[PDB]
Design a protein around this ligand. Structure first.
Ligand SMILES: [Mg+2]
Ligand SMILES: [Mg+2]
Ligand SMILES: [Mg+2]
Ligand SMILES: [Mg+2]
Ligand SMILES: [Mg+2]
Ligand SMILES: [Mg+2]
Ligand SMILES: [Mg+2]
Ligand SMILES: [Mg+2]
Ligand SMILES: [Mg+2]
Ligand SMILES: [Mg+2]
Ligand SMILES: [Mg+2]
Ligand SMILES: [Mg+2]
Ligand SMILES: [Mg+2]
Ligand SMILES: [Mg+2]
Ligand SMILES: [Mg+2]
Ligand SMILES: [Mg+2]
Ligand SMILES: [Mg+2]
Ligand SMILES: [Mg+2]
Ligand SMILES: [Mg+2]
Ligand SMILES: [Mg+2]
Ligand SMILES: [Mg+2]
Ligand SMILES: [Mg+2]
Ligand SMILES: [Mg+2]
Ligand SMILES: [Mg+2]
Ligand SMILES: [Mg+2]
Ligand SMILES: [Mg+2]
Ligand SMILES: [Mg+2]
Ligand SMILES: [Mg+2]
Ligand SMILES: [Mg+2]
Ligand SMILES: [Mg+2]
Ligand SMILES: [Mg+2]
Ligand SMILES: [Mg+2]
Ligand SMILES: [Mg+2]
Ligand SMILES: [Mg+2]
Ligand SMILES: [Mg+2]
Ligand SMILES: [Mg+2]
Ligand SMILES: [Mg+2]
Ligand SMILES: [Mg+2]
Ligand SMILES: [Mg+2]
Ligand SMILES: [Mg+2]
Ligand SMILES: [Mg+2]
Ligand SMILES: [Mg+2]
Ligand SMILES: [Mg+2]
Ligand SMILES: [Mg+2]
Ligand SMILES: [Mg+2]
Ligand SMILES: [Mg+2]
Ligand SMILES: [Mg+2]
Ligand SMILES: [Mg+2]
Ligand SMILES: [Mg+2]
Ligand SMILES: [Mg+2]
Ligand SMILES: [Mg+2]
Ligand SMILES: [Mg+2]
Ligand SMILES: [Mg+2]
Ligand SMILES: [Mg+2]
Ligand SMILES: [Mg+2]
Ligand SMILES: [Mg+2]
Ligand SMILES: [Mg+2]
Ligand SMILES: [Mg+2]
Ligand SMILES: [Mg+2]
Ligand SMILES: [Mg+2]
Ligand SMILES: [Mg+2]
Ligand SMILES: [Mg+2]
Ligand SMILES: [Mg+2]
Ligand SMILES: [Mg+2]
Lengths: 126, 263, 188
RNA sequence: UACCUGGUUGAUCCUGCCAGUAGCAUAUGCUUGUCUCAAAGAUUAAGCCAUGCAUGUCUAAGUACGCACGGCCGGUACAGUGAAACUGCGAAUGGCUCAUUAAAUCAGUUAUGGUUCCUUUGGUCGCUACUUGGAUAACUGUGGUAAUUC
RNA sequence: GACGACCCAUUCGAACGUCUGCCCUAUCAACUUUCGAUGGUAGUCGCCGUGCCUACCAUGGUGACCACGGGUGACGGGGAAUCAGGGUUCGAUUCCGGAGAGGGAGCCUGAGAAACGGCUACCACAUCCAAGGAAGGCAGCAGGCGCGCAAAUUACCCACUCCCGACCCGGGGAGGUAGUGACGAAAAAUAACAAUACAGGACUCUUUCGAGGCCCUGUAAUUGGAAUGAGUCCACUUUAAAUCCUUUAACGAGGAUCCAUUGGAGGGCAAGUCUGGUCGCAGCAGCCGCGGUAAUUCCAGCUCCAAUAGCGUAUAUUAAAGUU
RNA sequence: CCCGCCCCUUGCCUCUCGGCGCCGGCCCGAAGCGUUUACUUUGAAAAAAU
């Protein structure tokens, strides 16, 4: 195939239970590579799993060909579940998002600020 | 308005030797109150993501520091904007490495790994001398420490080598003509040389001379001298190039000859 | 509001003071024809980047010799000029910079080298090819006709590796017509 | 780029100005394919303002008898999640505008040996006791006014 | 280990004070004082120095080196425009300092406020009413009226930078993101190339004529085939979630469109002593000047000029101005 | 055009406490500053952005 991975400025971070590096993808002729299709080749490179691997960034140059991004590879799964930002755990579902606007949260708080002892119906009856 | 103390610090107004960029966002970390001045400090957040690259965003620094990994002079600091400064000795146990904050010769801090049999003592510069209640003599160093019952020959402007588990000063270098010195203020920042002189204008900012290992001399103010050695023999370890402050016509030649464009 | 932005920007040309002057209009029109540029402004850029070099050269030449500043910055300016093929290493001194003409910065343009190194039929054909992404410098497509070619980049200019002119699928015209033989001349 | 050109006379030489000329920044007219940056209710009226939002906060570690949910049956300091409420802290930073104001404000330079300082950092902590007192909120229940974070 | 706490130091400051530094005005030449103005002694008060304020005493202090009064479309500075050399004009505006939340005044709490997203009262406005009473402050973010020559959406989100909190967890119109945007700045498309025919020159040959001819330009008819994005549009990528740009499949060019405009053509000042119309009218013209039946200047066609994704006009200002 | 010589050359003094020499005795660096300014040259010290 044309696609190829090459790492750069590798660093083994023990203070956060991961190894981080920069990723080069030499993929001429084709569109950008999907993130899924990258992370499994990193696995085969480091012999762990396509589950403790996270990748992001990935801007493509002018002219086609290369792209460069950032990648991290955790030791356990749960260390990733602790040390990752939540939205990056959401990308490949491992977390979920809730309340449907900033307005509703704001305006509930302002209605509740005008009652004492039990804020009651403003939450319990919406 | 200003009716009380401020608590934010704008990115442009921040100190220069922090070497911060311009286009991330409007603020800068604003070191918290501590033993080191606001312009002379280096917050712990700037040491872990702008220098050692260990973290990437502010939250990663916060969750590195919370796990109690980082030690500043033995103690375990959990505040990410803590003001580390000249002669402080960061220790990262989980990795097994240590550092000493010393000015690099362009006038900024740089990483300087030290051997773990050295990161047990740090130097301090005497700032005050007074006799407390009942006749006890005291001491105040540059990083706010207070030593009770010091030897009755240590005076102002001297240097003292303490231990990090006891305080309790061990050795002391006396400021006079012929000892080593590192300069910690103004134009000549991070240069080393023998003191070689001291003039005294009573009531205003006594001046001091120095002399490098290549004849170069450079005056300064006495409140900016920091003795680091008995003479020609620095007690603490030194960064590469040892405060020699080569000119730009030399910096170009070394850049060209070494051809340090890769590795 | 405070905001995380660079407002720093600058102009790169200066209009001439005499707006209708024949000695000027005919020379600039000559320079547009001989190198195939688009406006007058494409010439006033080159005039600016030369008239600004000629101020640093002069202000150095009015320092005294042996100066630190003059030495350092002169050795830096001559290096920068030599490195783009505007000056000869057999000159390498400030009193020669004042002898450079505008038609040496114009000569080092990629449009000029793509014609003069043989890859195109004319100085106008070259500007079309560059703008159509047919040419490559060193493992890198480029699309800007005004790109200035550094001295040792010179012999890298060649046709792109994804392009009809040398190892590439035929374009959307050579393919629409070869299909007219199998979709318009076989059963159509 | 250290530059001028038209205009008093029948013509000439001058003083001398009006006009042309190039940049800049506010408004406005005609016109408008691509792509990277990005200023924008200052000028007049520091004039007036409908609606929404812009400041809140809990850890192993101040106070838990809400059955609100709760497990292996027990609180025998008392489990455990924990609404509310007392307590502490913050609200004096940030944001907006340029009316005032000419030795004032502000800048560089110096001084507190003439003062105060939440917090952080280091000192300092020895001239009924196996543990004292009464009284409030949330909660239960009865209410007033058209109306309010009464 | 968490918490609290006396005092000392340190830190972040704050406050007061020294030297020098300011636009225009003489149609402002004397000003200042028991309603403290300059000084001394003792106190009051205050965080401390001090006419800061009270009692007694002295009669001083400032000015042609511009005091004092008046004006400022005056908040100061880092800086901005133009600039041979010297200078002139601007600085409400993202960094630093100051001052203010309709106008004036008084205070609670606190380490810190004379605080207005705090309270009390008067002045001016304005809302609700059962006429007893109650409530208010957008020169925060959007939005609306008004004013005017003059200025964007009642969108999204704490992911980035940082701040606050009892805090690894909550919150943030600070801040980030997208929308409107010809204020302005950078890069840059609207045609490239052959054949053929005419056109023109160096060269060859011919005494020439003439012919051969290589190098270019237009210009025609077609063509001739090739090239590529502007667009339509699957996916990946982007990001908090999206958009944009970049990366890629599929469609997408024959020129009568996938159409370049704005101002000129006497001089200054690049470009027509063409044709039709008007007749000192209508109009043009920054200035000189055009038009009275034969207009290089008006109205229009044609052609030509300058800059070009931009160009014209009004106004303030700088160089020209050795016309400060 | 750094030293000392025609009378002067950092202009002297007189010391004293502490280091530099010789074999106690004697020799030379520091303390006083040179009558004062303006000028010129060098150092120190001066936020970032522009
Ligand atoms: Mg403020
Ligand atoms: Mg205020
Ligand atoms: Mg902080
Ligand atoms: Mg006359
Ligand atoms: Mg005449
Ligand atoms: Mg004029
Ligand atoms: Mg113009
Ligand atoms: Mg943008
Ligand atoms: Mg602007
Ligand atoms: Mg206004
Ligand atoms: Mg409202
Ligand atoms: Mg709990
Ligand atoms: Mg509990
Ligand atoms: Mg409370
Ligand atoms: Mg408080
Ligand atoms: Mg605004
Ligand atoms: Mg005021
Ligand atoms: Mg005045
Ligand atoms: Mg006044
Ligand atoms: Mg003053
Ligand atoms: Mg100051
Ligand atoms: Mg001052
Ligand atoms: Mg606190
Ligand atoms: Mg303490
Ligand atoms: Mg008195
Ligand atoms: Mg007194
Ligand atoms: Mg008098
Ligand atoms: Mg008098
Ligand atoms: Mg006055
Ligand atoms: Mg001003
Ligand atoms: Mg004003
Ligand atoms: Mg200039
Ligand atoms: Mg300003
Ligand atoms: Mg104004
Ligand atoms: Mg504004
Ligand atoms: Mg400000
Ligand atoms: Mg100040
Ligand atoms: Mg108002
Ligand atoms: Mg408080
Ligand atoms: Mg107030
Ligand atoms: Mg406020
Ligand atoms: Mg209120
Ligand atoms: Mg009220
Ligand atoms: Mg308000
Ligand atoms: Mg508003
Ligand atoms: Mg209107
Ligand atoms: Mg506008
Ligand atoms: Mg309007
Ligand atoms: Mg955040
Ligand atoms: Mg949060
Ligand atoms: Mg905002
Ligand atoms: Mg533009
Ligand atoms: Mg078009
Ligand atoms: Mg495109
Ligand atoms: Mg997504
Ligand atoms: Mg036209
Ligand atoms: Mg006209
Ligand atoms: Mg005409
Ligand atoms: Mg003309
Ligand atoms: Mg002409
Ligand atoms: Mg007629
Ligand atoms: Mg006629
Ligand atoms: Mg005619
Ligand atoms: Mg002028």
């Amino acid at each position: 195939d044309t696609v190829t991975i090459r790492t750069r400025k590798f660093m083994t971070n023990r203070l956060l239970q991961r190894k981080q590096m920069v990723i080069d993808v030499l993929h001429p002729g084709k569109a950008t590579v999907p993130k899924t299709e990258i992370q499994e080749k990193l696995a085969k490179m480091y012999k762990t799993t396509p589950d403790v691997i996270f990748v992001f960034g990935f801007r493509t140059h002018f002219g086609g060909g290369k792209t460069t991004g950032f990648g991290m590879i955790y030791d356990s799964l749960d260390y990733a579940k602790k040390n990752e930002p939540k939205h990056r755990l959401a990308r490949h579902g491992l977390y979920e998002k809730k309340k449907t606007s900033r307005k509703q949260r704001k305006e509930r708080k302002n209605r509740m600020k005008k009652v004492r002892g039990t804020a009651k119906a403003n939450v319990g009856a919406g | 308005m200003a009716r009380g103390p401020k608590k934010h610090l704008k990115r442009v107004a921040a100190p220069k030797h922090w070497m911060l960029d311009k286009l991330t966002s409007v603020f800068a970390p604003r070191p918290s109150t501590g033993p080191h001045k606001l312009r002379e400090c280096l917050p712990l957040i700037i040491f872990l993501r702008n220098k050692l690259k260990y973290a990437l965003t502010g939250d990663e620094v916060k969750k590195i520091c919370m796990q109690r990994f980082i030690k500043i002079d033995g103690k375990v600091r959990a505040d990410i904007t803590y003001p580390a400064g000249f002669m402080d000795v960061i220790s990262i146990d989980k990795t097994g490495e240590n550092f000493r904050l010393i000015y690099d010769t362009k006038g900024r801090f740089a990483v300087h790994r030290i051997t773990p049999e050295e990161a047990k003592y740090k130097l301090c510069k005497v700032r005050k001398i007074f006799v407390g209640t009942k006749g006890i003599p005291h001491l105040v160093t540059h990083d706010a420490r207070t030593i009770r019952y010091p030897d009755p020959l240590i005076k102002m402007n001297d240097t003292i080598q303490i231990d990090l588990e006891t305080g309790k000063i061990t050795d002391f270098i006396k400021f006079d003509t012929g000892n080593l010195c590192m300069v910690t203020g103004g134009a000549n920042l991070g240069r080393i040389g023998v003191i070689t002189n001291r003039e005294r204008h009573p009531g205003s900012f006594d001046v001091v001379h120095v002399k490098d290992a290549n004849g170069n001399s450079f005056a300064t103010r006495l409140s900016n001298i920091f003795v680091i050695g008995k003479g020609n023999k620095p007690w603490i370890s030194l960064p590469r190039g040892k405060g020699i402050r080569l000119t730009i016509a030399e910096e170009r030649d070394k850049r060209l000859a070494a051809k340090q464009s890769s590795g | 509001m405070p905001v995380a932005r660079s407002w720093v920007c600058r102009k790169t040309y200066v209009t001439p003071r005499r707006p209708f002057e024949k000695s000027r209009l005919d020379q600039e029109l000559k320079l547009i024809g001989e190198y195939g540029l688009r406006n007058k402004r494409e010439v006033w850029r080159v005039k600016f980047t030369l008239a600004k070099i000629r101020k640093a050269a002069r202000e150095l030449l009015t320092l005294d010799e042996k100066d630190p500043r003059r030495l350092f910055e002169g050795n830096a300016l001559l290096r920068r000029l030599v490195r783009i093929g505007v000056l000869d290493e057999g000159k390498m001194k400030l009193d020669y910079i004042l002898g450079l003409k505008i038609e040496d910065f114009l000569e080092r343009r990629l449009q000029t080298q793509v014609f003069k190194l043989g890859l195109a039929k004319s100085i106008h054909h070259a500007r079309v090819l560059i703008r159509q992404r047919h040419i490559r410098v060193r493992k890198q497509v480029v699309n800007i006709p005004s790109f200035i070619v550094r001295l040792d980049s010179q012999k890298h200019i060649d046709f792109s590796l994804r392009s009809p002119y040398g190892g590439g699928r035929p374009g959307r015209v050579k393919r629409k017509n070869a299909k007219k033989g199998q979709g318009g001349a076989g059963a159509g």
